[PDB]
Every structure is written in C-alpha cells, then in structure tokens.
Amino acid sequence: GHMGSPVSYYFSYADGGTSHTEYPDDSSAGSFILDITSYKKTGNSTKALSWNASGDSWIHVNGSSVSYDENPAKERRTGLVTLKQDESGKTLSLKIVQPGKTSID
C-alpha cells in the first residue's frame, strides 16, 4: 500500500482483554510468561515499551516475565497488582485467588 498513518500505541494483553485472574488449588505457584502487548508502531518500526507494576508483596515482574509466590498462611486472599507503561498508560489488572498453605516450601 503506502505509508502516512499516525503512531498507534498497543496497551492490552493480546487476545481481547486487559485483565487476568487465576484460581489455583492444592499447591500451584511458580514463574511463567504472558501474551501481553506494549509497543508503539510508527514509521516502519515498533519501539517496545517497558511497564512497571506493584500491589501485594509476593508478586514479581521482569518485563516479559511473571512470578507469584506460594501463600504464607492457610487463608484465601485475592493477590492484586496493577501496571502502567513508560510513555503511555498500559493498565492491566492481575488477580490470583489461591488457597493458602503452611508448609516448609
């Protein structure tokens, strides 16, 4: 075709949403990766953008990396975390509702 469109930022997961939730059982915690989008497309390029996060203590982000630690008492909480982008406002909502533990792990 041609070129001449404005910049477009990308600030979602990837499949049609901006919010994750998980409901593990027994014992499920560890480090995974997620289908998230964070860039601005313009010219004939995509500069990616980092994001930052926080909420509960036990939840860890390293760009395209994710971990959520296993629960410190037997209660069930909802762990809750936000995020935002460097040049933009990529907000997602992360929830983890895990049953709780008391074990030497």
Side-chain angles (χ1 to χ4, degrees):
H2 75 103
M3 290 171 57
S5 297
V7 53
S8 306
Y9 276 57
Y10 287 68
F11 54 99
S12 39
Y13 266 105
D15 190 354
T18 35
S19 36
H20 266 36
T21 309
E22 202 121 295
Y23 299 89
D25 204 295
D26 196 3
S27 304
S28 309
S31 51
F32 54 86
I33 303 188
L34 284 169
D35 288 280
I36 303 158
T37 319
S38 193
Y39 60 83
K40 66 95 128 73
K41 179 172 264 221
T42 183
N44 180 41
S45 177
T46 58
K47 272 187 71 261
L49 286 174
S50 301
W51 64 87
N52 75 119
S54 47
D56 271 77
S57 33
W58 45 270
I59 304 172
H60 294 256
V61 67
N62 236 242
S64 308
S65 227
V66 207
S67 313
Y68 322 80
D69 205 71
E70 208 191 331
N71 216 68
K74 315 103 149 178
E75 287 183 78
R76 204 188 304 272
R77 296 257 183 94
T78 305
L80 204 83
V81 199
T82 321
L83 36 169
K84 203 241 195 175
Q85 205 173 83
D86 178 268
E87 304 194 93
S88 205
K90 90 162 271 75
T91 71
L92 258 36
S93 354
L94 207 309
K95 292 141 73 197
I96 317 95
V97 179
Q98 71 181 286
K101 163 262 278 278
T102 45
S103 313
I104 60 175
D105 260 289

